Amino acid sequence: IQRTPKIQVYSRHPAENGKSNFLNCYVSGFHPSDIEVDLLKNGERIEKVEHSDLSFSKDWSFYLLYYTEFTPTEKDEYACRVNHVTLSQPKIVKWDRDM
Amino acid sequence: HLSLLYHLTAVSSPAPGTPAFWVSGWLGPQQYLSYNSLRGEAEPCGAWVWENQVSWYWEKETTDLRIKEKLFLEAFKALGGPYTLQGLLGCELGPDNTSVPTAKFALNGEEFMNFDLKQGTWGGDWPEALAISQRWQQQDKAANKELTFLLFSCPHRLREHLERGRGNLEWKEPPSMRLKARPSSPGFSVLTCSAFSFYPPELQLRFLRNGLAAGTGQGDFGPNSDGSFHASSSLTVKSGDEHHYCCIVQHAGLAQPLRVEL
Ligand SMILES: CC(=O)c1c(C)nc2ncnn2c1-c1cccc(F)c1
């Protein structure tokens, strides 16, 4: 079967402009395991991005964590862009600093 | 009530540069082990790197997972793809200090097979489960090795980790909390209570309005790269009414529930 990913974007610590932090894109609940994930800074792909192993939950759906070191500012916008066979087009989820 | 659980995955057509077979090993909510068929070595993860384990520990994990790698890849030849085969194998110390095994498998994301420790056999209703089971049952010593892995090796390892890495599991990191409102559709705002960088993962978020229960909100939960966790809950409220709400968090790191204001 196929399961479409759930996408969550959040920082590791509460965001403070000018303070170094990590931005996370957590993708979960998907099947099959092949998936493409980019982090974006004002729409531009971020190059220095790390990720976890691909794991899976009790219902057999996969999950994995993408993360990058960043320093938030007032004006910079970040997003996570995900492609998967269940998606008609890449899905882009914006980082909401409150989440 | 701590589980040691291996998450095994094999794929029949791995993308180039990615492994046909990989494993993550978990102690409760913590990943302690990584393995993939390209590197061919089991490795510790995170704080478990500094666990001062017995000399042969990681060589034995590597030995067992190389055997399971061969078994998983043989399963595809038994099937009539592409295919994904997953297994959840491990144990938990239950009441009365005995080990309780888990041995379940999924094909293309559907549970379809298990290992019956009483008969020493893999089984399931689907013809694909019969086929893979027969192929594994026919390989010499495979059922025996699976029995030893579940009844002896897994509880032994779990006990070795409770003896040398129990500190990792006693980590208590209380959450850093934020409660913020943002405008939404006309006449409404969204209130979000967020909990950052906490451990253990069990956490409850609740909203009150003028001290009265206002619901749990719609919650999300996820990890950070160090194995701590993140959570948030969001509630739609009428705009201008945001300041009558607060959020309450309960977490094992906090002796009492903590009230969070805007
Ligand atoms: C690297 C990383 O993100 C990481 C590590 C090292 N240990 C962990 N323990 C519990 N979560 N957790 C995370 C993780 C592991 C796999 C998938 C995932 F989405 C997150």
Author numbering:
A (entry chain B): 1 to 99
B (entry chain A): 4 to 83, 86 to 267
The authors write:
FcRn facilitates new-born humoral immunity by regulating Immunoglobulin (IgG) transport across the epithelium. In addition, it has been shown to bind to IgG and Human Serum Albumin (HSA) at nonoverlapping sites in a pH-dependent manner. Existing as a heterodimer composed of β2-microglobulin (β2m) and a membrane-anchored α-chain, FcRn is homologous to the class I major histocompatibility complex (MHC1). FcRn has been proposed as a drug target in the treatment of autoimmune diseases, in which pathogenic autoantibodies are detrimental to health.
In order to select compounds for crystallographic studies, active molecules were further tested in Saturated Transfer Difference NMR experiments and by Surface Plasmon Resonance (SPR), yielding an estimated KD of 80 μM for the highest affinity fragment, the racemate UCB-FcRn-84. Chiral separation showed preferential binding of the R enantiomer. Competition of UCB-FcRn-84 with IgG was tested in a FcRnECD–IgG FRET assay; however, no measurable inhibition was observed. Confirmed hits from the fragment-screen were soaked into FcRnECD crystals that had been grown under acidic conditions. UCB-FcRn-84 was found in the conserved cavity at the interface of β2m and the α-chain, as predicted by SiteMap. Key properties of binding interactions include burial of the 3-fluorophenyl group in a hydrophobic cavity composed of Y26β2m, S52β2m, Y63β2m, L65β2m, W29α-chain and P228α-chain. The most visually striking feature of the binding pocket is a tunnel-like cavity that extends through the middle of the protein. The bicyclic ring of UCB-FcRn-84 occupies this cavity, being involved in one direct and one water-mediated hydrogen bond to the main-chain of Q34α-chain. As the fragment was centrally located in this region, it afforded us a tractable chemical platform to explore the binding site further. We attempted to improve the affinity of UCB-FcRn-84 by better occupying space around the 3-fluorophenyl group, which was nested in a well-defined hydrophobic pocket.
